Design a protein around this ligand. Structure first.
Ligand SMILES: [Mg+2]
Length: 124
């Protein structure tokens, strides 16, 4: 796992964006940027050459599931591994996210410990 991989953190609650960001900082990943909704994350991915996406699942403008779909329908972006953040792991929403092509999921609140298992798991 390369620690200079360009990571996009997507979440509508800015405090959550900065917590995810410091957890990634504690793990060797410092190349992080932010977006507050999928509508604002999309143009960032579209032009920014990112390597990894961490997105919230429920956002007001465009949802986590709809950004993953747009990423997956975009020829240029379809190779992007996506980790989803969710308030509780309901079986039904996860299966849906799995079917939509997400790489993994993590339930909040979470720690740097969990985050890394999730990252290792995704990258295999
Ligand atoms: Mg949210």
């Amino acid at each position: 796992a390369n620690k200079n991989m360009k990571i996009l953190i997507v979440d509508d609650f800015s405090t959550m964006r900065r917590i995810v960001k410091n957890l990634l900082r504690d793990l060797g990943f410092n190349n992080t940027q932010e977006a507050d909704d999928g509508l604002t994350a999309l143009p960032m991915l579209k032009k920014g050459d990112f390597d990894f996406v961490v997105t919230d699942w429920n956002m007001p403008g465009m949802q986590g599931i709809d950004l993953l779909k747009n990423i997956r329908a975009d020829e240029e972006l379809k190779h992007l591994p996506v980790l989803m953040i969710t308030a509780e792991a309901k079986r039904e929403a996860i299966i849906e996210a799995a079917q939509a092509g997400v790489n993994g999921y993590i339930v909040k609140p979470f720690t740097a410990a969990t985050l890394k298992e999730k990252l290792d798991k995704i990258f295999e």
